[model samples]
Target: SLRSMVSDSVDEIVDGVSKTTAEVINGRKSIAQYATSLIENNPEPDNVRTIISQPLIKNTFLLVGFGLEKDGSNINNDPSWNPGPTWDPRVRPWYKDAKNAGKLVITAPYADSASGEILVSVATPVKDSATGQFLGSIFYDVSLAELAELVNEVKLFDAGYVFIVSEDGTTIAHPKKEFNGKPMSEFLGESKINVDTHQVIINGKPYAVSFSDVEGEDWYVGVVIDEEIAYAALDELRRS
Candidate 1:
């Protein structure tokens, strides 16, 4: 069995982060419209999902899209190049059902390395306001590495490592490279996905995970924390 790695505090932090991110993301209609416009136009039939991975959009994910780019590092490796149908994780039955129900659809967050970074990609069906028809979804894939740095830089804690995951239990980012393409379930040898709760165990250690959906890209922002060291602010905190 995969070790249960999260605690009550994990939910508190995740919820707070989700609310703050959502509030800030939802507040900006212009940014959302801009990305939408880019998606709306572009003669390429592939739509925004493919286009969002472009250097222009990917580099500016934090500013205009979902902010997945890394700072002070040459992190670009083109994560958008899909591994084809073989990479698709058949995890979310709810997404299709939501679309069928005539509502905005959101997939349970899953690790999508398509960006070359650990990110949780969220999809929302973009609708044509006039025709009341679905036009394709706006995808948002949020990076967890930056958030981890942010947490450390601001002195929130001394040793917490932030990791994001997909709803289907795939890891978006972590200290281990082996987790790159493996599902969190497979990583931890679990049979089911765990999204509703925070924290999961791998290799006998407990850790925390959280999920959120940002507006423009519909990206799920997931946070992973090592229970023992994440909140050790005093032990590792100092002026940056």
Candidate 2:
């Protein structure tokens, strides 16, 4: 059945996202541990440059930056970077929030003026294991587009599409570029995906949708196909 097809695809999407998210986090966490250990031994500029030299896996971090609280020195892998004189990592939320949490944290999505892409940061505060003193933070910028590639692989039908939305009601990845960063309400309007039946309306067009919950995050995955196309075979049988 088309319902089962969509449901299975949605499950695949959930599985893919859950695994990819974990891989990215684990990769960053490994760097966090390395930086923490380096700082604990010696807070030297030459050693800090080693962090910048580390190769970022493709489709992960756009720019990985690190800064030590002791000397207020920060380094970004992107050589074209210049934040002006007023920028201070010690006072930035990316650093302070992780410091406050004492663990890894994600930042709110915001538009980057340079690329006009919405980006979020995965950050963790580095601390001395011996004294628990705040050392600094290792953080990186990741575009929502990084996650979009996963959804782009699944094509249900001619007009079928997939989208993932966060608990905040905003979309994480969507087939349509315009809808990528917008809230789900704008796409669904008065319609909702929670209905038991596959029928739902978006943009005044009826759709057959199957949605599922993501295991790793408080997110929803939806697969939407055009109702007419989805039921075309049945319509043909009736006509015959």
Candidate 3:
């Protein structure tokens, strides 16, 4: 029975993923507007690339400054990496992938104990102004768990709930008060909603799904709504 419940929920999550895709697309479009301003205010007469990238980096760095020691080195190393600021293993992996794929790298959600919050990282290769070379990257963190709550609150059901799952099987968001920091793989083995394959089903019930990638970050955005609950009101209508 629990398997069925979880399976059905996974289908719902897929639908949520679909909705999230649209949201992220709109979000990126709005964010891209800053590029024009960044280019317009280019102060470095010699290197336009560096100047344009400055504002982008500065803004993103501010968003991810939470839980950091406040020394400002978190810009080089994530606060979660112990021992110092130079240990950014996660970024490197995604960096390599983005370089090769020429696409945004939207990282899965992770709990930053330093910040005590769940966040998703979005990284994209920064291009040089004159040469058009991939200078480096721009990244920012988004509050993932709180996002799930927002989705859950919008639609409520008795036995129905909403959760955000990561590519790594981490539960980025959940309605349960204490379920924030655990990885889903630990409890659920692996994610049922296969974003790669894009197939989601449960108990013979299909679902509506949405998906998108974080513009620069190597993270996937997904939104889902449970079918049974989505149509729950219909049953009452039928009864009348």
Candidate 4:
């Protein structure tokens, strides 16, 4: 029962994030222009935390809208605005991923260094509307804490829990806050898991698992339950 609930929730998360990102990308020109226009006059918007864009030019950065400066200073006119040696946003993982996808992309979750909070980037590649030449990229930062609230909602059995992992096997969201951002393998240590059956031994105990891929991204949701508990009902039915 818990497994089914969690699986459904994970599906919603994947689809919800994907759809939101797609909507932003589809009207990228207007969003980009509006975001760019704010560069000269920084104003805090209610919903948007930050608007970041990088042009084709070297060592250029724009922070048109700011909730709080990435650095602990006034964003309106920060002296350290362009700490340069050519930081190219295009080469960043988020940019590369969105570019390769040729659409809006959600990056794998990681700890934001500045805030030390789990976060992911939603990004789309930008291009010159007239010439159709590549310009750079536009991105928005989102907090994973909201997703954490969603994940923690499903309370499997006492010991059972649900978790999400990125395409590269990094734990994106988990019931246990400490486990977030760690590799999925780290939980099992030397043990190997049967991906199909979701079976594994952690701490010398057997567990049954269920998992599914979140479409349009390299991510999946997994549910873990005690093997005995998982089979108890079926075993009872068979006996009856």
Candidate 5:
């Protein structure tokens, strides 16, 4: 069943994202601790390079780093890349969202200015445990194409496809590129795909639908097949 297949893809995505999320959490914690250490023993920028780990650097996660603004503007990258002169960490979406949420956060998809490639940022605020002071933020960049392809590659029957949508109903990626970044309503016409749903009606047509939430973020992984065509195709196979 399509449900089984969709479930498999989601579990794999969940596992991948779960690991990535933990790394950012740990990475965020490390920066605040080191920020605390700066007063006791002024840790060098070079010393922070070891926080993100080599494995994280080589994966789809291209960058993991932090900034300490309250003490002063201090930007540190694990692989040692520098940003433009006018770049301010506080001005970035990742930093602002995390600070406002006061917990881990995932940002909307946007293309990287340097690579010109689409990606999302996972981030968290760095606060002093003792004084509860806001130090700055820690953030990680992940390739959007990498996660989108995870679903787009799942081959289904003719007129069947898979996609990922944000919790707000915006398409993160769809088999049809034209639908990318648009509302799912544009594609599904107000149809909602809930986790336990096995079918959905869209545009007065029935579709066999299955979906699950991507455990790592507020997103949904869904697969659908045109039921009218599917039954005919299934019987045709039997007749032949």
Candidate 6:
């Protein structure tokens, strides 16, 4: 129940932020023009960090907007930061996923190399309304801490806590940063947790796992309660 509740909340945040991004890409305006508009207006937390690029620039030019300030300024102009000689958005998972999906796509949870903060990128392919040509993609970045903060609020008896994982088992958000990015299969090895109630072995100990998929995404949110603690609760209930 706790895992389900938390997963629902995360879904709201992800969907709410990504809805506008999908709309912008689907709009009639040119991709480049709309991207420029986003940079100029600089929306709030939902579109906090935005990236828009086309193939013509060969990844040389990128429109990056940050929501750190009230005015929402483009960070590419910052002299201190350099993204290197060539950075191709086309090759990145965010862009590739959206292009492949032919619609809005949410990337698997990943850690920001610069900040080491868990993040997910929501992207949608920009297409020419008339010709239906692939223009590029617009990506909106969201920090996992936004979801993790609510996950941290989930109360699991004893040392138990909530965590999230991509469909393939990559840990999304966990209490320990070390566990993030590591696949659950590395330890569980081919063990599947597709059902509502499942058991997982973590650190050589068994945990009674309850999980649910985050709506509209391949990610799953799970709560791992110590087996002993869970069983004890059941035993107490039986006696009553």
TM-score winner: 2
Model 6 lDDT per residue over 1-240, tens place = 545544343344334433432343234124434553454344333442333433431132222322221222233322455444454455566667767887766678665534556566655565655566665555555555445555656444453666677777887766666666678665344446663556666777876555566654566676656656655554554578
Model 4, C-alpha of 62: deviation from truth (Å): 18
Which of the two candidates, 3 or 5, achieves a greater lDDT against the reference? 5
Task: Encode model 1's per-residue lDDT on 1-240: one tens digit a residue.
Answer: 112223544555556655665564454333444655565465133454455556555554432222111121111224544345543222223234334544433334344534444344333444556665554444444445544343323222533544434445555444454564367565455634444554567687876655554444433445556656754433343333
Instruction: Provide the overall lDDT of each model, using Cα atoms, as 2-decimal numbers.
Output: 0.45, 0.64, 0.46, 0.51, 0.61, 0.52
Model 6 root mean square deviation, Cα atoms: 10.2
Task: Give the clash total for candidate 5.
Answer: 0
Clashing pairs in model 2, backbone N/Cα/C closer than 3 A: none
lDDT agreement of model 4 with the native = 0.51
Q: What is the C-alpha RMSD of each candidate to the true structure, in Å?
A: 10.6, 4.3, 8.6, 9.2, 6.1, 10.2
Per-residue lDDT of candidate 2, residues 44-120 (tens digit) = 66676664556642234687677678876786667787767766788766777678878776665665535667766
Tens-place lDDT digits, model 5, residues 1-240: 544544454445434543544454356444544433443233345655544454644353677667676643654444356676766777777778878988777777665546655566777777675777777776677655555565555434465767777888877767665576678878776655566545567777777665666655677776666756655655565578
TM-score on alpha carbons, each prediction: 0.41, 0.75, 0.50, 0.55, 0.65, 0.58
Which candidate has the top score in lDDT?
Answer: 2
Off by over 4 Å in 3: 1-17, 24-26, 29-100, 111-116, 166-172, 176-191, 194-240
Model 1 RMSD in Å is: 10.6
- 1 versus 3: better lDDT goes to: 3
Candidate 5 stretches greater than 4 Å from native:
1-44, 71-82, 153-159, 175-178, 191-210, 232-240
On the 0 to 100 scale, the lDDT of residue 23 in model 5 is: 57
Global Cα lDDT for candidate 5: 0.61
Query: Which of 1 and 4 is ahead in lDDT?
Result: 4
